[PDB]
Amino acid sequence: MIKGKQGRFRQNLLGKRVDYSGRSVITVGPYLRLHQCGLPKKMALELFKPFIYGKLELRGLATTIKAAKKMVEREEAVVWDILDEVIREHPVLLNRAPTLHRLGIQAFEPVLIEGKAIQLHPLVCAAYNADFDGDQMAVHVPLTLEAQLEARALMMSTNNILSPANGEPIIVPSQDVVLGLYYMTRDCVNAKGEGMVLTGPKEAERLYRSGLASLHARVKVRITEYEKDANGELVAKTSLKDTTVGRAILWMIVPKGLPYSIVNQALGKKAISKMLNTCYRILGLKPTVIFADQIMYTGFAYAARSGASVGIDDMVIPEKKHEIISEAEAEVAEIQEQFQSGLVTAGERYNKVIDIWAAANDRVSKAMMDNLQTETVINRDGQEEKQVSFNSIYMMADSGARGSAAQIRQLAGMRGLMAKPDGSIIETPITANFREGLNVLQYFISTHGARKGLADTALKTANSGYLTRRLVDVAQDLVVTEDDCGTHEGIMMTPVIEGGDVKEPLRDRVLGRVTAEDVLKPGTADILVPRNTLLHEQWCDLLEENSVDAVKVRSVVSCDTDFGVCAHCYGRDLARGHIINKGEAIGVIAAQSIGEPGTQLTMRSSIQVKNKG
Amino acid sequence: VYSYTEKKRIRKDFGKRPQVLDVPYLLSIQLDSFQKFIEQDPEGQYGLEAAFRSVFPIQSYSGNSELQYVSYRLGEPVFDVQECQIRGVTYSAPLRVKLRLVIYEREAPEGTVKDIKEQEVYMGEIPLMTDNGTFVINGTERVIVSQLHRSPGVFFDSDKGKTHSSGKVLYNARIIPYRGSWLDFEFDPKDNLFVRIDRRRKLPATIILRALNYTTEQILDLFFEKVIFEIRDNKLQMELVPERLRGETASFDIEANGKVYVEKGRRITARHIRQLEKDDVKLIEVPVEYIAGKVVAKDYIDESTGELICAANMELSLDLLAKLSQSGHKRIETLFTNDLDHGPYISETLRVDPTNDRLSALVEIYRMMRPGEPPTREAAESLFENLFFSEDRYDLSAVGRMKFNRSLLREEIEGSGILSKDDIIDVMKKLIDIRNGKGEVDDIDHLGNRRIRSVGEMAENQFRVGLVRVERAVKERLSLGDLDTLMPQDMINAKPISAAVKEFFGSSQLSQFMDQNNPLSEITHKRRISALGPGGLTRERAGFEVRDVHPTHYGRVCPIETPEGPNIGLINSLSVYAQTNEYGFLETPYRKVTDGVVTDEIHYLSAIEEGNYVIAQANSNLDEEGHFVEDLVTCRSKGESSLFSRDQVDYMDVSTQQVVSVGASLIPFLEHDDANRALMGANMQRQAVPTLRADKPLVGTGMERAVAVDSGVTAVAKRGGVVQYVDASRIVIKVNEDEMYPGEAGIDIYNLTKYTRSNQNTCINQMPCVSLGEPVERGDVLADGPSTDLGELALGQNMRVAFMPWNGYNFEDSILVSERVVQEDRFTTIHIQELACVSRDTKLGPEEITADIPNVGEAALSKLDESGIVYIGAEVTGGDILVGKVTPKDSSLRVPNGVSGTVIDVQVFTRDGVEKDKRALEIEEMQLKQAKKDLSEELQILEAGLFSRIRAVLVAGGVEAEKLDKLPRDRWLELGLTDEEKQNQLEQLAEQYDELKHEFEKKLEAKRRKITQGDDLAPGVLKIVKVYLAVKRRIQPGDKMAGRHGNKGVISKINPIEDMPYDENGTPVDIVLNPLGVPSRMNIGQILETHLGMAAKGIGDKINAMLKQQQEVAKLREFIQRAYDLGADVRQKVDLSTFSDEEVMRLAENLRKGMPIATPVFDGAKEAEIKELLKLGDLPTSGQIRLYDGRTGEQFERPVTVGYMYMLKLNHLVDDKMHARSTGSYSLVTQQPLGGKAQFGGQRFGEMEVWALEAYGAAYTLQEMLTVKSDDVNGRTKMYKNIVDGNHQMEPGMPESFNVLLKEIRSLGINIELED
RNA sequence: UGGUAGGAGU
DNA sequence: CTCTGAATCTCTTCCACTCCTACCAAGGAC
DNA sequence: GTCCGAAGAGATTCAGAG
Ligand SMILES: [Mg+2]
């Protein structure tokens, strides 16, 4: 009763159960701001009971604690007014059942709602890995004043913009907002209101609302664009631009600093993420939060207005599929006939059959994709013309909202060859797609791999959990203690070249890390970078122009400080644009960042140069 | 022709393939196994009789007594199934056995026994199986899932390259008896055979042979060929058969008859082998260096002195052959060892083992088996004799012996249960042949190697385990000297058997608690096949390969239906047509294929026999004559599928749906969605809480009727007839004369079970689906159970569904439901709870249940009656007092918080001997009057039926139109009849009815006694009060709702009716889904399902318009005929001309709200048929309608899919999930218990959460969570006092868990000190 | 109550 | 025949949060 | 009224070899 998971050490000493906590199913709320979260009235009343008692005693409605308890149990009218005051600015901690990230627990400012479900912000759910399908989330109430300040300063969702694992943003439009933005920022060859010249974005919105102009009509709109050429000052630039109505409408929510070039494109998921990162780089944090909320609202509204839908006529089967299948079957029959005479061995026959079927699958997929992407043909002002299709499935695939090339290939093309449980490839692939039927044998062959993948995931979870626990414990003690060691030893940063293209660009590895020794300019007897300067975007860009391969960089293993590392060796915090603060628990952050992608990781001549040099 | 239940609503059925074999009885496995276990089965085989006959002959050590059983019988159960469920007692039947005891005369067993005793004995209670296949053990229905395990026999595991890092394969053989000790044979890296008994340490394999009194020469003869060498005058010529040496290089020059045929240093090919065989020169000459390599075989002794020149297994040498030359022996034996063909594996083992005699091997075996004990010759001999050749300790079942012989390629099927020396030798020879490359290993996952062990076999094994100890006790008692002292009743004890059976049936890994939320769940739970349990794998031990799906699972075990999670693949459901073999393996039907013709007769093929044949696919064109038109019909040969000629095929699949389970086959368009989503949908159908009103699915597979009738939920008429009397509580059927038995002909009465709590706390009720006077036949459903509609499985409701994003309310999987869904209460579910109160006998006086409760308001007592019990029908709420329960000194049972439902009934159980309170008197008198009313009503109705059937006899010339009326009311059976002997028959029947009503009143008195008698209770409690609350749940945000194709979701917002999107006609859509869920997880079944649902509802709306206004029957009939004749080549073929022109009206009435459509799993409607059906109505072919926004009023672009989809409400409610806590109870470690909502628990702040808390750098929050909210009791009270005063300080203190750990470590003699 | 399994959800 | 290598056995650990439903456990003898 | 798999690391031993 001391050792093991059931012992005191793991169950009780490190896993104490906490009062002032609750649990309920979560559901999406698009009305919420980024920092807010829904909270049922009954749950809020139960969690904040001592605060309600104290407020009742202070106000004077209840003389004694027993009277206040009875009044609260009666849930009288006055109790709700008192409650609204209490939870007005009191953050609550929300966490999911598996807590892999540092971001697995976040603080929100709660709003009283009716019901029994916690309303969560759609953008936040990406970090939580929440799916809104019976998912549950526990809430905790920080009592002490220090705890409240601490949650507000560190744990609030508005603070967690960049993940500690890497500098990429952790909030991003994901499923419907990105689809709405992609639908809005698109062009049609002929549409209502084409050729118009507009005064500004407000005119574009007025035209689209009144129905005179379509959301995709190409027009010429005067755009007021602000660029911060001066240090801390913005200069307006006004010019006529060839953009659609939808792009002009979206320009209203964009902040002042950003250029207009970002909105003019088709705005897929990568484009939206890049735009948010650009806003974070230029205008800071508060404009980025406001911009994220505006983007989510606008995307939801215009996705709803679009009325995108999936139907059995959306998935089109290429007309050449039957001919390709017939040719492949003829070739495989010919190879089998050659094998019957004994001319070709069984192993080479099997390999040739596999190659033939792979080639046929590639041809079918390419033909289907070519028929799909440019399926729509628009007649404009007389002569016909070609354009990117408006097929709903293709619109879902292109925008990155959902699906991929493989999913479409399975929906409207050959499912390809399926492996046996042992790992060998079945000779005959699944010819039929999911739009048309699958006979029993093909379904069995599919079920093989489906069950194998399900078991793989079910055990991957536990293996990754164990690895994460070991990593967290092996590196618990590390904390940034000192500020500078003054050491000269360091490791050498060079891009990794595995006999081909650059696997990792040099600027990516050395970004945010200080140098152990002064970097030497390609011009001899000259130094590009000082000895102890921290490399950032600008310093890396200056390093890009000279393009020196080898740069010595201070690292954690070379740190000479005992019982901890200095702030300079670690470098950037990767979550904020700052050198790491003293007292940061870098060991736990590192272990959690390593262990988080573990669930994704499955268990089971002549040398010629491509380019001149 | 169609059944009467089919006439009222006949489901349109697609599907071109005409089924040859109908779906068998769904629960046949459980019922058949239990019937085999416990029934009068002579000759032995398997059953209770076999278990009795195996053991009961008694041998006494000089006891001179023989005890044996004659027969066994089962007593009538004391209580009916409902009575056992209500009382909470097991539904068992006493086991009465006629045992006989015979003792011979002293020093004279040859003659007749001096005393012969025969007396029936009572042995124990065997829990009988209900009609549906369930067991009632303590008033709760339980099911015994059949277990799947490795079949007894011998297996040869490869063990390929796991160790030694050298890539060598360490072949091994394993023998698994049904009951005994495992015997293993292993190959060491040095090519040495090792034996391990019961997974003990390794031991040389030849020790077993030496322990089998086998001479070393005999072992060499068995495991090696003999090469004869002879001593001759001319070079001491060797004898060498040419056939012995094939394909090996010859170091010596091969000269036969002088001429050289094969030169030295050259290999021999086939031509030289054949040349030498033709020459047949067995004699040959070799250099004296060649013989030195060989090893002698037999013992050679010098005739001059008798000493051993060379013992067996001794390598020859120059001095050895010189001594043999001095010996003058004319025969030299050398073991034929060829590295490529044979192997010196046995010889090296004999070289390694130290034993050289039987006694040495025996003492080595004793040392290994029982270390530490000194070796005794007799003890070791007895141990080895009892290990593998004693019937009691070791036995191979008939299945085990059959598998063993089949693996050893023996023709004999049945043999001795115990092993034999020849069997072990053959196993070792087979392992050696496997090593040499002649043979193949056996795969464990092969379904021919795994077996099905149902409830009957496991219950029989448990009964045998219980019986052996009673047999031992009887033998021990018989050792005492006695003669005719006692009957053979006190000798045996019922307690061991009773305990051995009760423990298995109540506390076992496979005696699972039934879930009764659906008829489908009940069916599936009885069809489960769990690989876990006793004598099976565990979750941790089970490997990666076991969870995978084998190619032999086709037609036996469902590849789809299996629980995702920890035990994935370890638990899986039996397929539809698969029925277990008589030995225990799994079988599946197949249509025999004659010469080019597919016939009708069906052969059930096991796993092994399926490999040899060539089996066609279900989806192949037959054209009603056989002779598959394509000459390359796809067939699956042994473990592989490839095209074959139409004449090469030998068997055919019986039907398309013979692969999937029953649960997974309910999904329409199963062939259009990914296997993962199909698995999810199959698992989610089993968690659909039944709704307030059952609604049949508009589109379904078509087997829902079969799974509805084959479960016990619906009441099915056993004998057809007319409905004399129907009522919400019961149905009375007047049986037709032909089906009516002659003797004491009567009318059967069906009593429906009204609202009753299920295992999942859901309501179970029967609704009468027949009217007054409506004729019924045998096998039609009379009453609809939970979640069934007119005999069709109605799991959920079908509602209009639109696939479009809507303002982010359906973001990832959320679902937006119109308020119209809530308004018409079409997802409301009833929930029945059970609250029990016990009058415990504590100290300071017994606890009493009385009305007056000290220090409470009169309002609480107002709801209670004068006896302290809650009135039936009172609208109680959380906290309201239900019973008095006053304790001497207060603690009154009350409704838990968050519960608000009417109390439907209260049941009071009172200890025999104590007084009854006034409410107890009211309950008992009401129940007694109810029993009297039931008996009187059944008696009067049966009397009416019998006296009416007597009138039929009186009709034949014995009565007139007025004679019966003028006759008095007491003697209708007494009337002047023409036959004058059937009058005597009528008098006999009148006397029989007189005695029958005497029997009825006697059974009424027995029922009164059963109510009057003090029902048994556990010691320490006077009375038990059970209060049943019935809360009516309603849909709300946070509830989980799911479809059939694995597209689960949670309700997000109850949108107002006017805000929902509406089409041109103004009808709002009930639910809007999210389109993004389809492309990623490929489940196109729902899109096709919703298109077909729109088509069905379009047909329904067309006939509703044809019915709302008065239309002539001809027009409606011809439209329905057009709808039913839509399929291009469907097999349904309904003609409405044969209908009665009034049943057409009833069919139209039942179809006005929808046109049911059947689409089998792999033979469903194609897209073209759906488009044609849509065109039959006035609907667009594309299936997409232009919808207008509810609030803006502006029409959406991009026409949006709209249709009717069958949606389920899952048992994952939200009011049962939401929980909160500020301050409550604490444990011994002063942490909060977290019994969840049960005892107001706090959510656990796990280990992985403090990592995230401290990764943020948040120290103060971590400190408060670790100390002030969990363990610091002083910190807890100080923080609570500070909060109410407006202060938010914090005293850290020390957690109590740390002090507990300190004391725990100090308790082991280790000094822990917080030194300063 | 408390320790065990049993099934299920993420 | 000491003494680096290889055989054996032997211990330890295999995610994290819930929803619950049961099974379980010291007397008559002195 | 009172009492008697499976994977790895590691410790131990053991067989080869000079
Ligand atoms: Mg989820």
Automatic annotation (TrEMBL), chain A:
<feature type="binding site">
    <location>
        <position position="135"/>
    </location>
    <ligand>
        <name>Mg(2+)</name>
    </ligand>
</feature>
<feature type="binding site">
    <location>
        <position position="569"/>
    </location>
    <ligand>
        <name>Zn(2+) 2</name>
    </ligand>
</feature>
<comment type="similarity">
    <text>In the C-terminal section; belongs to the RNA polymerase beta' chain family.</text>
</comment>
<feature type="binding site">
    <location>
        <position position="133"/>
    </location>
    <ligand>
        <name>Mg(2+)</name>
    </ligand>
</feature>
<protein>
    <recommendedName>
        <fullName>DNA-directed RNA polymerase subunit beta'</fullName>
    </recommendedName>
</protein>
<feature type="binding site">
    <location>
        <position position="131"/>
    </location>
    <ligand>
        <name>Mg(2+)</name>
    </ligand>
</feature>
<feature type="binding site">
    <location>
        <position position="566"/>
    </location>
    <ligand>
        <name>Zn(2+) 2</name>
    </ligand>
</feature>
<comment type="function">
    <text>DNA-dependent RNA polymerase catalyzes the transcription of DNA into RNA using the four ribonucleoside triphosphates as substrates.</text>
</comment>
<comment type="subunit">
    <text>The RNAP catalytic core consists of 2 alpha, 1 beta, 1 beta' and 1 omega subunit. When a sigma factor is associated with the core the holoenzyme is formed, which can initiate transcription.</text>
</comment>
<feature type="binding site">
    <location>
        <position position="485"/>
    </location>
    <ligand>
        <name>Zn(2+) 2</name>
    </ligand>
</feature>
<comment type="similarity">
    <text>Belongs to the RNA polymerase beta' chain family.</text>
</comment>
<feature type="binding site">
    <location>
        <position position="559"/>
    </location>
    <ligand>
        <name>Zn(2+) 2</name>
    </ligand>
</feature>
<feature type="domain" description="RNA polymerase N-terminal">
    <location>
        <begin position="1"/>
        <end position="185"/>
    </location>
</feature>
Automatic annotation (TrEMBL), chain B:
<dbReference type="InterPro" id="IPR007645">
    <property type="entry name" value="RNA_pol_Rpb2_3"/>
</dbReference>
<feature type="modified residue" description="N6-acetyllysine">
    <location>
        <position position="1175"/>
    </location>
</feature>
<keyword id="KW-0175">Coiled coil</keyword>
<dbReference type="InterPro" id="IPR007121">
    <property type="entry name" value="RNA_pol_bsu_CS"/>
</dbReference>
<dbReference type="Pfam" id="PF04563">
    <property type="entry name" value="RNA_pol_Rpb2_1"/>
</dbReference>
<dbReference type="Pfam" id="PF04560">
    <property type="entry name" value="RNA_pol_Rpb2_7"/>
</dbReference>
<protein>
    <recommendedName>
        <fullName>DNA-directed RNA polymerase subunit beta</fullName>
        <ecNumber>2.7.7.6</ecNumber>
    </recommendedName>
</protein>
<feature type="domain" description="DNA-directed RNA polymerase beta subunit external 1">
    <location>
        <begin position="590"/>
        <end position="655"/>
    </location>
</feature>
<dbReference type="InterPro" id="IPR007641">
    <property type="entry name" value="RNA_pol_Rpb2_7"/>
</dbReference>
<comment type="function">
    <text>DNA-dependent RNA polymerase catalyzes the transcription of DNA into RNA using the four ribonucleoside triphosphates as substrates.</text>
</comment>
<feature type="domain" description="RNA polymerase Rpb2">
    <location>
        <begin position="150"/>
        <end position="232"/>
    </location>
</feature>
<dbReference type="Pfam" id="PF00562">
    <property type="entry name" value="RNA_pol_Rpb2_6"/>
</dbReference>
<dbReference type="InterPro" id="IPR037034">
    <property type="entry name" value="RNA_pol_Rpb2_2_sf"/>
</dbReference>
<dbReference type="InterPro" id="IPR042107">
    <property type="entry name" value="DNA-dir_RNA_pol_bsu_ext_1_sf"/>
</dbReference>
<keyword id="KW-0240">DNA-directed RNA polymerase</keyword>
<dbReference type="InterPro" id="IPR014724">
    <property type="entry name" value="RNA_pol_RPB2_OB-fold"/>
</dbReference>
<feature type="domain" description="RNA polymerase Rpb2">
    <location>
        <begin position="344"/>
        <end position="453"/>
    </location>
</feature>
<feature type="coiled-coil region">
    <location>
        <begin position="979"/>
        <end position="1010"/>
    </location>
</feature>
<dbReference type="InterPro" id="IPR010243">
    <property type="entry name" value="RNA_pol_bsu_bac"/>
</dbReference>
<dbReference type="InterPro" id="IPR007120">
    <property type="entry name" value="DNA-dir_RNAP_su2_dom"/>
</dbReference>
<keyword id="KW-0548">Nucleotidyltransferase</keyword>
<dbReference type="Pfam" id="PF10385">
    <property type="entry name" value="RNA_pol_Rpb2_45"/>
</dbReference>
